[model samples]
Target: AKMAFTLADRVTEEMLADKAALVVEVVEENYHDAPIVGIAVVNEHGRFFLRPETALADPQFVAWLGDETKKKSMFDSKRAAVALKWKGIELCGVSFDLLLAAYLLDPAQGVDDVAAAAKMKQYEAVRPDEAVYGKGAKRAVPDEPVLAEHLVRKAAAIWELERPFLDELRRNEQDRLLVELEQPLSSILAEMEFAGVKVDTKRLEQMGKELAEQLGTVEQRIYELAGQEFNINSPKQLGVILFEKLQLPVLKKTKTGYSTSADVLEKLAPYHEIVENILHYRQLGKLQSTYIEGLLKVVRPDTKKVHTIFNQALTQTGRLSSTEPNLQNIPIRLEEGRKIRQAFVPSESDWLIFAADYSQIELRVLAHIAEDDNLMEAFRRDLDIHTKTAMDIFQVSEDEVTPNMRRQAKAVNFGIVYGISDYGLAQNLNISRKEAAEFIERYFESFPGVKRYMENIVQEAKQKGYVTTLLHRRRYLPDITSRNFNVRSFAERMAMNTPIQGSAADIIKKAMIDLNARLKEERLQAHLLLQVHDELILEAPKEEMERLCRLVPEVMEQAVTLRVPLKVDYHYGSTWYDAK
Candidate 1:
């Protein structure tokens, strides 16, 4: 269907005031404080286009966009809201977001733009904005006639798609997931993106210098241990030094020679001290380059803050991802890697970086969803779950459970939640396959409910074609019924784990939405800064820190209810590192 539209010089109050809602799109040359070129708006009354300056200059137009009294519908409204907000518009009442609507219906479809939403809703006449505006460096605002025409078409596609998309969401019983969860989260995320996290440039540079020094020291130690100076980065050269010269046991062979992969070297770590130094050298080098230099490069020169773009629609499990130097991927297990967090300082002086993370959220999700009686009882009693599992699996008293047993049990618990196979568990624990299998058997025997839940979820996925989180966020697993063993096995694993993992994601997101609201309701100075998977990081004035410590966990725990209680742990300091 063709979308007909009129080009308007300016928007009058009558063009917007009486409309129940409008499909709106913001046309901009860049993101984040960039000038909006124009806005295309449409309703049953008519489709119209006007320059942003002309629209914003009109009190009625600004009032209509910012009106909190009435609800509105739009495509990619979160981004549009942010863009409008940058132009000093509040942009409330976005009751429908076509981008999120299409995403909930089929997350794998990757609906980030109106074009994708149109395609998902089968509105084939609509073309990507890129087609008219060009892309990348070639992109430029078209002449008014062409640009106005394109935006009107875009807005028209959004207008046409809204009813069908919202209908489908209701049909799938996911309207709440969209309206109550995703829609509000979008605005909160927009605010967080705008309130970018500050970075300590001097702290980062100091880290880079120290990491470089550590790398050099490790590199020299590796060379001395190997009795020769060689290019440590060369896997081939290091392979010969370790296998041929040092005579370390060759665990695996590649076409090039000895397999010098991290895992391969890890297996040979006990054989020689040089292997340990080489591993340390690799870690320090990566830290020096990726986390230190990499983060410094992305820090906005003026603000000294890195505004990582959160990808809300990309992941299949409904988990958010970060790019533009992914803040989420910052390594934490190593001290050197963890120190990278020190550079993440509060934006204001005397303000503190507060972090709160759910403890064993995925595992808690597993216990609740699986309804494993013993697992639930263990959590109810507040027993260290790994130690409890060890005692149960090893058939020993709590005091008799050895450290190694607890360690092995820790792997088993996480392994099971992730749907790891015996082979994978064996690799993780460096145990014989038979032993791994036995441990799994013992674990299942100790908690038969969990085993039953795993089996049932896979079977359910095979029959239903999808699995859903507690919040009803669905993940379609088409490969669950595949004839190939590996393909089917993977889907089967996903079938068991997606609900658990997805529900954890759902919980945190709920926490974020709730926490954001609570902050507003109380008129607290604290604001949410970032979401790192199971954790929520906020920046708060020192005066508000005590209140946040109580409020954050309380709201997060109450975000959702489960058979097992949700738990949250928190920390605060001048920097992200101390908060940990």
Candidate 2:
């Protein structure tokens, strides 16, 4: 006789009785014995087998038959049927579904059985994993039972602690999106990693050597000025030479000693020749170490190229980060720093390197988001953005906007984006903070819409607890409600700046995605190698040079629609320095 069955268990008495009746009926239909050692329950049709030699069957025979007969018949068909039914029935019910759900919740927590056991100890509730696997001390263990026990306990503790957050994610719709959207996005990111950019290593190495020699000269000069030679790389020794020996006024002091930071040194430059030499030395050293030396180290041995990994996940704003070598933070503010780009040459012989950057992208984003008439008109007319702001703020005619006025306007443009405090503005402009505040106020009066937009965004963020960019990228600012003044103030600034900076970031990312697609569609060989915040670097064949130089800017300008027209500046060179 073949015994086929299923088993079910319920928490309540009524449900358990109903399940019991179902199991008995299944056992009867499958021709199971009435004097069976264990119960049999069946649901869906399935087949299973068991061996009488197993421990479960041996025990069952002892319970049903006399001790002497049980020992003899433990290997007999009767014992085998009982053991098979016991193990087979354990497989019945919604256990599998529950286990699958737990796995989905935290795959990083490891296998379902282990996680389930841990959850029971940590929380009273039976989570999906626990429901599928037996709970508590009876849980099965593989080899290394102690390790399995430890893992199960840890997983349960973690699940219990993170339950509230999981519930919150579900409530916010982020949980479903995380599974559907974020998971797919992660796959897309992997594709991007595989599509790595090519680098011109020979050119980079040449540039590296040149930069090192230049830096050596600057280092020697600083040492001569100090009247003694020491480790130029050592900040401690440099600080002593600057403050103690030279007797220069201490601008700032850190825990270690006097601050020889670039900002402090820049301020002291006007007072002493040694300060100016030290600043020069520092800049050259950074260029050599960070740009020249750093780039050389990252260059791949096989390709003789540096392939920078662009991180889509690094920033809350939609900005990209480069690793292996951080191409974004490459020194570019100073002429010396900008010279590093000259080394970024084309991959093919006789090919040219092309670079293009958005003209006042952040300001353009502000104008579009704010819907400011004056700003939009200026951009539409292809007028110089900073010059126009200078004309308006200084109350000068268009042609009358001098270099000084434009410079100040440029400072104001960047200052506002950074949530510049009055003291910061004063320091930037080399004027009294009070005067800087007055200028800021006056500038706001001239461009009231810009001011209104900033104030409105801050208020909205405070109410909403977050801000969003044009592309719907969100940045939460919980500190907007903080009791601490500095913390709240920083949050307020982020509330204001995030939208502008984030929108700018979105625009550039859109441009990159579009440009990459278009290049492939057109069957163009030109490759996008690096992207700085507002700029993109590309290497194109000389044969395609003219076509790319034109096509790159066209694609970038049309990447997204905005209230203000976008502009791109381009440069081409044999070496990065030559191109600059």
Candidate 3:
């Protein structure tokens, strides 16, 4: 069955008022600008391509859109909110978000675009934006009629998708998950995106200068070691210098030449000091260009803030990611990368950067989901989980568990939850495959419930073709029944991991929404800033600091009640680095 829509040149109060709701597709000039050029609106009456400057010149259209009483639906409402809120338009009474709906129904497919959402719903009437506008260098906004039809066709697809998706949500028992959690999250994320994080430009500049000097020194050392100057950036040249000239043993080779990749170079590091210098040089170069220069390019000059767009529908495991200077991937493991956080400061004067992170969240989620008695008991007693695992796996008393044993146990604990293969665990632990396999075997024997869960989830996914998060966010794994061993193994791991990881993802998102509302209700002047996986970063005044110290954990812990209690650790300082 096909839905019908007619295009109209103008919009009227009567035409909009008589309808139950309107589906809108915002048309922007480009990706950067949020202020929309126009919008395509579809309702029971017809579709209207209303240009803000021309067709929507009247105050009536503007006033109607601003009216929060009316029902509005769209795909990717977060993106729409940016454009709408930019014009002081408040979107309320949102009936559905097709992007999020598609995600809830099938998370593995990236449904950030309307075309993907339409395809997810099996709505084939509308053409993909890429098809209509071309792609890459050839991409451009089409002529007026072409663009107008394209927009309305999207609105038509949304119209077709809305009821069916809602119906499916009801059948899948995820309506509350969509309505209560994700929809509210969209608004919160939109506001967070608009309220960008502040950056100290001068701090970054000084760091860049220091890094440049270090890179220069490292480069010169590499040159002196090589007995000549060459392009440090060129892999071929670096490979020649390392392998052919230096007579270092080659671990691997690519089609072009010797593989000077990180892993390959890491093996050769023991052979020569020059290998280490070259590695350091590459690391410094990345830090200089990607972190230092990359961030500066995106920071808004007027506000000294970087408005990172949080991709809500991109990840397969229901995790949120940021782009345009990705804050999430800023390295915490490396000292040089950690210094980059120093450039991030509170947006307001005299405000401190407050950070709160859930400790062992994934492990906790694993315990709850796996229903592993020993695992749950460890978390319930608030024992150091890795330490407990070390004792169990090594068959030793608490006092007898060495630091090395505990470290290996920690690796095994995470490795088990992720369904890591013997080979993968061996690579991670730098142990023989047989040792890794034995460690995993000991772990399973120590915690039989987890082994049961690993088997059950795989069987369930194979039978049903999908697995779900605690909130019923579905991840389809079609390859669970694949003929190939590697593909099937990968899907089985996803089956085991998705529920644990996705549940953790769901809990943190809920906490964000809860904390955001809590902030407003309490009338605190503090703002929720960045969310890096399990952690929530915020900027609060000194006055609210004490209250937030209590309030944040209280809100987060109760976000969802699992068998094991969720633990959050918090810190605050003048800069992001110190907050850790």
Candidate 4:
């Protein structure tokens, strides 16, 4: 926090003009319910405006236009690419795209405004958007005069910010990551965003009605078990029926009443028929609320499709997020929740949905990153990893590995990657903490490289105060050196896991960007619609379906050059549910 900035600045005085920038504003993203028509950008010339879709239609501002109207969108590529045509251009060098700056500033904070980013550089002139337009439901497009003022203010603020962010990127050694990867990747993501997936409205309606019937049957059974019909959806009412009327033992208590939460009911499931019925009802209820009904609200009347927004700058690990009925949040654990994928259909006639995902992507990443000979050997052999892990850790042969042993082995590896508290593994595996500790011991003993990697990473974080992905995308672990065990331990897990997982994310994104080009290069009719975790889903013409089946795996398998070769498994069917 000392005055070391001026001294460093003197050495490399190159500003945004001297270098490059990465800017993708999300002001509209926060305020609007749907995706923006196009995003705003700040170019080499100290000017900014909305692209493709002009928000300001006033012909009076024509003089300000530099005549680059037909520019393609960075995030939503399939959306009308700067639809308006303006000819006589001011020829100049325009080289950088800006969302990487937002991510670098702290992907956790997720820079959402030009004002705040500008202020960070000590260039503050723009008004807070909410100060004028209000937030949430109260937000609206200002009147023409106010709108002009607002846009100009924010644009000027963004223009002023470019210089600082470029310098910051250079200082942080993130310039190459911005210009090479994130910047161009922005266009690929935009294209995927606009090429929104097709939703099977008819199938969804049928599923919803079927769910309604199931709910009624389940609700009736629940009421009969309780010996009275009350609001089953009401936690208070259900609690009364469970604890008082049915006289079931209370496993837990909430502030309002005996806890009727899922965890409580799950525990009580074997206790009584009433509890089982209640659990069944709770599961179906959430499906109806979040999927059946919640989904209907988002699908547009005009397009008959749902266009979910992918938040590129949201995650520190460089994974993208889907919102406005986040597609990523779809439950794959339960059959009913997994059935929600049935509603996703191909947009075109006779087009099939093809989905491909990395097989044990994280473990493969772990193998590569740790350079564990055993782990890499396991992958190279294409052995069933869980079974292999079970046999190795349990000191058993391939034929001796039981199903439960394989399951436990999978849990142990996943547990370590993401803040795997010893107690968490104990609870998950139904083992004692003592048992959990020993199980982990055996796992690391079988793979000593992994244990060494974890120890060295925590120490590295303490020295650098940060962790990075394979791509040099950053996550600062301020708590890595904290005195508290729990506080510091979480950061240690984060430092250990971020690189392995983030590299997988980076691999997938590179696949998306490169795959987008492949579709054009090969003239394939397939279009990518969604990216859920490591999986890529595309809708392709049936004529090209056979080709796509081979193409997807080929592209994904080579997304990154890992120590062990990457593996991609794929399936295709008429609907997303079938593909999955």
Which candidate number would show the highest TM-score if scored against the true structure?
3
lDDT scores of the candidates, listed in order: 0.84, 0.59, 0.83, 0.70
- What count of clashes does model 2 give? 11
TM-scores vs. true structure, each candidate: 0.92, 0.67, 0.94, 0.85
Please write out the lDDT profile of model 1 over residues 292-333, one tens digit for every residue.
888888788999988766777878788988776688888777
In model 3, the worst 10-residue window by lDDT is 23-32
Q: Give model 1's TM-score versus the native structure.
A: 0.92
lDDT score, candidate 1 = 0.84
Model 4 C-alpha lDDT per residue in residues 119-179, reported as the tens digit of each score: 5667666676677678888876565345445555554555555656778788878887776
- In order of TM-score, best first, we have 3, 1, 4, 2
Q: Give the range where candidate 4 is weakest over 10 consecutive residues by summed lDDT.
A: 1-10
Query: Candidate 3 on 1-580: residue-level lDDT in tens?
Result: 2334444566666456523334344434223345454567777767677665644456676666666676677888778776666566666667688888888888777664677888876777777877876767775667767777777778877877888899999999999989999899988887777888899999999999988988889999999999999998898888889888998987765777888888888778899999889888888888788899999999998999988788888888988888887888876666788899999999888899999999999999989998999999999999999899999999999999999999999999989988899998998898899999999999999999999999899999989998999888888899878899999999999999999999999999999999998998999988888898799999989788899999999999999999999999998998988897
lDDT at position 82, candidate 4 = 19
The lDDT, on a scale of 0 to 1, for candidate 3 is: 0.83
Return the number of clashes found in candidate 1.
0
Those runs of model 3 whose alpha carbons end farther than 4 Å from true positions after fitting are 1-10, 18-33, 54-58, 253-255
